[PDB]
Design a binder for this molecule. Structure first.
Ligand SMILES: Cc1cc2nc3c(=O)[nH]c(=O)nc-3n(C[C@H](O)[C@H](O)[C@H](O)COP(=O)(O)OP(=O)(O)OC[C@H]3O[C@@H](n4cnc5c(N)ncnc54)[C@H](O)[C@@H]3O)c2cc1C
Ligand SMILES: Cc1cc2nc3c(=O)[nH]c(=O)nc-3n(C[C@H](O)[C@H](O)[C@H](O)COP(=O)(O)OP(=O)(O)OC[C@H]3O[C@@H](n4cnc5c(N)ncnc54)[C@H](O)[C@@H]3O)c2cc1C
Ligand SMILES: Cc1cc2nc3c(=O)[nH]c(=O)nc-3n(C[C@H](O)[C@H](O)[C@H](O)COP(=O)(O)OP(=O)(O)OC[C@H]3O[C@@H](n4cnc5c(N)ncnc54)[C@H](O)[C@@H]3O)c2cc1C
Ligand SMILES: Cc1cc2nc3c(=O)[nH]c(=O)nc-3n(C[C@H](O)[C@H](O)[C@H](O)COP(=O)(O)OP(=O)(O)OC[C@H]3O[C@@H](n4cnc5c(N)ncnc54)[C@H](O)[C@@H]3O)c2cc1C
Lengths: 175, 170
């Protein structure tokens, strides 16, 4: 379970307060994903993650930013593969469930192993899922940036709304 | 821009599959801005933007490697992230449009951080950032911004969002 290398950063004095930083970042609305993987054992691990975006089309890359300590991150880097489950409009308590300080997060959660090393796919709770080979990981401040090469996954056009978060409220597509 | 070696699996999905998956992730809409060498304002529409770190306070943006806005941003070593609001549809289109002079008919003002263009109208908030690092990741450059200035507008009742080829408010 090795530590990724810290990214060399030029940090000027005169950076904002943590409170100013959240007031600024909390103005940017986001999706809600559950990043999943398989322990060395084969137990399903996951955490609620909002810091996800596409990086590259050719080759097909995305990134997630996870806290350095995360057990899911540790399992994810050991395994070398993870899934990004983009939560649907009804999945506000799936969000809270994968953010909760508990050991068995997948207790009474519907999931299937994916094509790529059996990473957990939450078919019932998602608008889409990506299955990724870990292409790179770098420590950047109090988070690790993980870059994933998309090996499999697909959209669910049958699901008409995503989960969205802005200024301490969840929302959905108006259907 | 740092060169980053990728442990790629032969077996990567094709471009259109990738877009169908990423298109299902709902995204805020921002205009990344900077000043050119002798102070021409540059800007592009950017949805690949997220919070990275509380302390130090970092955000990142992903931009095409061949971007002239990126080339100028890296030259000046600072940029702004303007988070567009509900009414900002046409501003998003303009800074996406493959045209010159994107700031023509746009209300902007130089920021406290190097005069990086802060957009007056059609924004819920702006961050001003020093370039802390930049990484080549396939066909994009990941720019890590250390937040030195900016603030929200609580009065602004909705940000711009984009999902499955539609804009919405919120
Ligand atoms: C969208 C979202 C993202 C979150 N990301 C993290 C996280 O990366 N690590 C973590 O430990 N807890 C995270 N949390 C939980 C968070 O720490 C607490 O809910 C926080 O105390 C609430 O502060 P706030 O209302 O100002 O921020 P929120 O309403 O939670 O969101 C403010 C913004 O802070 C950004 N952010 C970046 N790094 C952090 C960080 N270390 N802590 C909090 N917000 C951060 C997020 O992108 C978010 O958009 C997140 C919560 C939400 C809703
Ligand atoms: C809407 C939302 C978004 C979040 N986004 C992020 C995020 O992008 N990155 C992150 O690191 N945490 C994020 N969090 C916080 C994270 O889901 C919780 O802090 C979670 O409990 C940590 O899981 P862990 O196994 O890594 O924790 P450990 O401390 O390893 O548990 C043992 C978010 C939480 C919420 C509610
Ligand atoms: C939100 C959004 C983001 C875009 N990002 C880029 C970009 O970073 N670079 C670029 O050259 N063109 C980008 N474009 C332009 C786009 O690639 C073209 O318009 C193309 O025709 C795709 O349209 P589409 O309807 O198939 O998918 P869209 O609805 O245009 O895109 C679906 C999703 O795929 C991702 N995406 C799209 N294009 C790229 C890309 N080239 N690299 C990485 N992720 C991408 C984004 O997450 C987007 O939300 C973007 C367009 C939109 C609407
Ligand atoms: C909602 C949304 C989100 C997006 N998110 C992203 C994203 O996250 N990342 C991303 O990379 N893209 C993203 N895109 C796509 C991006 O905004 C467009 O591809 C944009 O046109 C790129 O601008 P650029 O300056 O980087 O392009 P460039 O190709 O560098 O230049 C843009 C235009 O400038 C002019 N020009 C070029 N060279 C010169 C010159 N020497 N002198 C004068 N004029 C010149 C030309 O007309 C050229 O077409 C997004 C688009 C949308 C709609």
């Amino acid at each position: 379970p090795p530590e990724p290398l810290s990214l060399p950063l030029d940090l000027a004095p005169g950076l904002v307060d943590g409170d100013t930083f959240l007031s600024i970042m909390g103005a940017l609305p986001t999706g809600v994903t559950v990043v999943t993987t398989l322990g060395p054992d084969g137990e399903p691990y996951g955490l609620t993650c909002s810091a996800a975006c596409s990086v590259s089309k050719a080759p097909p890359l995305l990134l997630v930013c996870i806290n350095r300590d995360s057990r899911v991150l540790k399992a994810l880097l050991e395994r070398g593969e993870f899934a990004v489950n983009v939560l649907r409009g009804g999945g506000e308590s799936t969000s809270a469930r994968f953010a909760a300080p508990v050991d068995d997060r997948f207790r009474d959660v519907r999931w299937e192993p994916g094509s790529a090393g059996g990473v957990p796919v939450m078919s019932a709770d998602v608008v889409a899922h990506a299955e990724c080979r870990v292409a790179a990981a770098l420590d950047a401040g109090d988070h690790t940036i993980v870059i994933g090469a998309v090996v499999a996954g697909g959209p669910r056009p049958e699901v008409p709304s995503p989960l969205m978060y802005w200024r301490r409220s969840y929302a959905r597509w108006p259907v």
